């Protein structure tokens, strides 16, 4: 299918997965899976078979994009070009020459990255499934988009549209709604029972009932959000709204310069969680939240938590998680406030880091000798801070007992 893509440029895997679903290579008869997980898995063996190579890591804990090998492009062309097989790939010829409304029936529409804004005719086609407009400089979209009962995708990242029309609530089927945070969603979101992934939902200056409507949307796996305007008990509603749906596989809450009045100390998370990210480094948790325990959420592979202070037992508790493949813990006190870089003391336990390849104690006074007897058996990477005054009584050591392949340190001015 990739022959549609040009010769020499990167290819994002999300577009491939969504378009395969839209045009119909994805059909699940089990009714126990949501045909998105299997699509991602399909791409996973596709990249596994060494037909395609990975490039980068996106905001979904997976490969950011990919590129087909040059000797495979002509191969796939020879296999399936002459036989029967519309989109615009960085070409300005569209519009002035080609007529789009002429096509009576077409399955997918994708014109992202262009510089043309003439979309007001979506009512002429009904069998359309994919509608992507990423960075197309479109000022506004037609009011009658709701006519398309068959719909799965709606891509609007990087466009000048400032508010979505209310005629999208009537969409009986919809899976992904790639919305930029600046533009406001229409009310009545709860009617979108089949919503599957929801990215960068702008959430501020919104009444409580709209927040309550989210929990009816029991099909999520990724849910990227943010908030700036309800730093009060209103977020307590979404606190339990997130608790209703049981299929989370990623989550992150962007928020700037404030205590997180969003997640409570007495909360039940979904039994499955992998990412649980917190991209903004200007925010902080008061302490390590109490719901991070070995009991629940025992399948994390990514932490990326910033918190006001790292207690001596904080890393001790963090080391008890079963997988915890990646760990990035910041220390807001050291950088934004004049506080000494204290050294942690991890004493108890025997394994304490079953599979922790990446560990980034940014601002923590962690020392390689602080790990007792192989506390991190693999630990391919490690970052820490080492003040120069610590040269006394065998602080550093760095026994190299745990084959840390690379390793980068930060120096301190004092002494």
């Amino acid at each position: 299918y990739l022959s549609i893509f040009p010769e020499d440029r990167e290819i994002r895997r999300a577009r491939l997965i969504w378009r395969w679903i839209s045009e119909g290579f994805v059909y699940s008869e089990k009714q126990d899976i949501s045909l998105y997980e299997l699509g991602d898995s399909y791409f996973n063996e596709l990249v596994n078979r060494s037909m395609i190579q990975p490039i980068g890591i996106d905001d979904e804990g997976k490969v950011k994009a990919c590129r087909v090998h040059d000797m495979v492009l002509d191969l796939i062309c020879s296999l399936s070009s002459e036989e029967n097989f519309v989109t615009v790939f960085s070409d300005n010829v569209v519009g002035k020459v080609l007529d789009i409304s002429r096509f009576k029936v077409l399955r997918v529409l994708d014109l992202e990255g262009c510089h043309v804004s003439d979309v007001g005719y979506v009512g002429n086609l009904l069998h359309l499934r994919y509608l992507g407009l990423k960075g197309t400089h479109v000022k506004d979209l037609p009011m009658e988009i709701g006519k398309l009962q068959f719909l799965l995708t709606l891509d609007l990242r990087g466009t000048k549209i400032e508010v979505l029309p209310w005629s999208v609530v009537q969409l009986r089927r919809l899976m992904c709604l790639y919305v930029d945070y600046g533009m406001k969603l229409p009310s009545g979101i709860g009617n979108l029972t089949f919503l599957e992934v929801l990215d960068d939902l702008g959430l501020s200056d919104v009444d409580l009932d709209f927040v309550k409507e989210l929990g009816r949307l029991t099909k999520l796996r990724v849910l990227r959000l943010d908030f700036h305007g309800f730093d009060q008990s209103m977020g307590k509603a979404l606190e339990e709204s997130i608790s209703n749906m049981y299929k989370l596989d990623s989550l992150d809450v962007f928020v700037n310069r404030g205590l997180i009045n969003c997640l409570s100390e007495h909360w039940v998370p979904p039994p499955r969680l992998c990412r649980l990210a917190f991209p903004s480094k200007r925010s902080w948790f008061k302490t390590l939240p109490s719901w991070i325990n070995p009991s629940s959420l025992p399948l994390l592979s990514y932490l990326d938590i910033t918190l006001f202070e790292v207690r001596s037992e904080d890393i001790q508790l963090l080391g008890t998680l079963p997988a915890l493949v990646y760990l990035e813990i910041w220390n807001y006190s050291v950088f934004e406030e004049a506080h000494e870089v204290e050294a942690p003391v991890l004493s108890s336990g025997a394994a304490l880091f079953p599979c922790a390849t990446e560990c980034r104690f940014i601002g923590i006074g962690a020392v390689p000798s602080m790990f007792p007897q192989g506390a991190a058996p693999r630990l391919k990477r490690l970052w820490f801070t080492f003040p120069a005054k610590w040269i006394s009584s065998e602080n550093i050591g760095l026994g190299m007992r745990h084959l840390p392949s690379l390793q980068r340190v930060v120096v301190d001015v004092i002494s």
């Binding site: 400089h137 700036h228 930060v410």
Partner: protein, 379 residues
Amino acid sequence: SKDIREYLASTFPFEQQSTILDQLKFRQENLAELKDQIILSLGNWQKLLDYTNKLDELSNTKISPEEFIEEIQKVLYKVKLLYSQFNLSIQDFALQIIHSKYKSNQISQNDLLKLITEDEMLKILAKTKVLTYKMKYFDSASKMGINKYISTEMMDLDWQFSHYKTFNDALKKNKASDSSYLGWLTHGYSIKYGLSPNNERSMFFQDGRKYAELYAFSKSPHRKIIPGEHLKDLLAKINKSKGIFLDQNALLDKRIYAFHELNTLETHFPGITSSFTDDLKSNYRKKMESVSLTCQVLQEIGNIHRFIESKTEYGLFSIPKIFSIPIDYKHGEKENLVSYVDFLYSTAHERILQDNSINQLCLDPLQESLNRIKSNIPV
């Protein structure tokens, strides 16, 4: 040397501004004069008058510091969005009040920093700076063709916008990161409100995650060696803009636009565009310094031309009627303006390089400004 340095210390303008060579009554009168034209549009136009009277009684009367912050935030938080122009001056005078007496330390700077660090005040001041500049100086600068040579970082040096000097410098001394934050905010607002007209969306500003990535780089600079996703894109865009800037046949408009954002993002987050090999090969730093001096000097000729033509175009509500600049010629003008311009040109010409791709950005605008300004001083 002192022949003109003494003169710039004696006249009415040029003291509130700093020159590359190196007052209570004035704004009290403007405060009093603000309430005249308000009542003439009473024929929906009463809330502004109420705000003006509240601000006047707030500034004139003496208020304890424990209440002033509440008083000044009450009025400031209410304003949200010919009628529009009168509204922008309401908040421009509002946040001038804080700087107006902070220099006299009527408010403890700790409380001032506590106030500014709020997310609302930062965005409010970043927006109001570019709005105030575009309201008054943009119209005057458009005639001279110096419209493209208006730089966000360089706006604090104008005499009117002296009440951002403290808001940035004291904040930088006390809270390092928030200064870069509000610089990023103000350039985003400038690029969104037509000071830099461009059809394409800005990829450096007006996006919280971009600033978060820049801050994460700032606190752990060893991230640049091996950055993660969402920072590959930012570095790639930096390199693209740098290549556009360094071009020879590129259009002046988009090249100057690229230079502006490159200068902002390099000044406020140092060590982000510094490449050891390419910059040394292509004389990057010297070219940036040349263009920055060119922009300073162009603002200097702009101010000189506004002053000579005035002898109101400084801007609405800028200079009051009583303290205006009369049209009459003066004895010292002949002996202290031509020499001042000549010394400015000499100082600029001694530390600016020359090249086929730089003369259009540094030498050519300077010669054009000199030709324009030497043919109208007597008239």
